[PDB]
């Protein structure tokens, strides 16, 4: 029943139903695995973390998941602060000069200087290099996030820490369709850096304002849209000179060497 409520996108109803299941069978680790993931989709971070702890205690084999995703949930809170201009994200790989105006634009927006913020983003975008490549076999001349606050930057969680990765620091990305409910929130990815490094990563898969300002469908990544405020909610979307690809549909992305 909770399963079917989830499928219908009825999150509140699904949660109510699932909590009653857990209450009925409180030592069933699998119900608590469902519950943690559902709470994550709903953005109830502390409660999702609570369930992970209990999962860890019931099923010790689940402990590496518990470690990975409890620190992923901590990172999801840094996101709100980052996009509110209150927290500086670290940058992985070679420093990119044009990140600085992007970050300053976030803090100028927060102070109500939207014109000055737009001026800095325009300068950042001008400076950021168009790098050609391929999505699968389909070529592009440039690629960026549809979120103008990011442009050609990828949000990542790597080794337990939130970061921005300039796309010009990226050589390739490989991702599969989402498989588990938690994958709607954090899509697993294999990254290869322009500098040679390779790392597994988690990609925050929804825009940060989705939890507070989206609907259930946006929280489930079943749509992407822009609010009257101009901010996007729902599933991450990449745009190119030639088309667009939503993150859940991306499989292989490659950039041509500079």
């Amino acid at each position: 029943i909770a399963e079917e409520l989830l499928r219908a996108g009825r999150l509140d109803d699904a949660l109510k139903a699932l909590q009653e299941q857990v209450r009925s069978q409180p030592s069933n680790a699998t119900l608590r695995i469902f519950l943690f993931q559902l709470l994550a989709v709903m953005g109830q971070w502390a409660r999702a973390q609570n369930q992970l702890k209990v999962v860890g205690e019931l099923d010790a084999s689940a402990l590496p998941m518990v470690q990975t995703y409890s620190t992923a949930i901590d990172c999801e809170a840094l996101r709100r602060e980052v996009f509110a201009g209150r927290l500086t994200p670290v940058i992985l790989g070679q420093p990119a000069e044009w990140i600085a105006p992007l970050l300053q634009a976030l803090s100028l927006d927060a102070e109500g200087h939207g014109e000055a913020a737009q001026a800095l983003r325009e300068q950042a975008f001008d400076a950021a290099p168009a790098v050609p490549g391929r999505i699968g076999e389909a070529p592009f001349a440039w690629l960026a996030d549809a979120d103008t606050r990011l442009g050609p930057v990828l949000e990542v969680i790597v080794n337990g820490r939130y970061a921005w990765l300039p796309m010009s620091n990226l050589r390739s990305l490989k991702v599969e369709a989402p498989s588990d409910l938690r994958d709607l929130v954090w899509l697993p990815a294999e990254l290869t850096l322009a500098n040679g490094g390779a790392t597994v990563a988690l990609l925050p898969a929804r825009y940060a304002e989705t939890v507070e300002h989206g609907d259930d469908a946006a929280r489930l990544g079943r749509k992407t849209e822009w609010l009257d405020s101009g901010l996007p909610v729902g599933q991450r979307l990449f745009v190119t000179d030639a088309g667009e690809t939503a993150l859940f549909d991306l499989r292989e992305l490659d950039f041509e060497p500079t």
Partner: peptide, 24 residues
Amino acid sequence: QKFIARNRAPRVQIEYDVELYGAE
């Protein structure tokens, strides 16, 4: 025009059936 989405209309997406009970 680089890096700019030309359209900000809502996007309908492919929906994925996902697993609910697995931790590996």
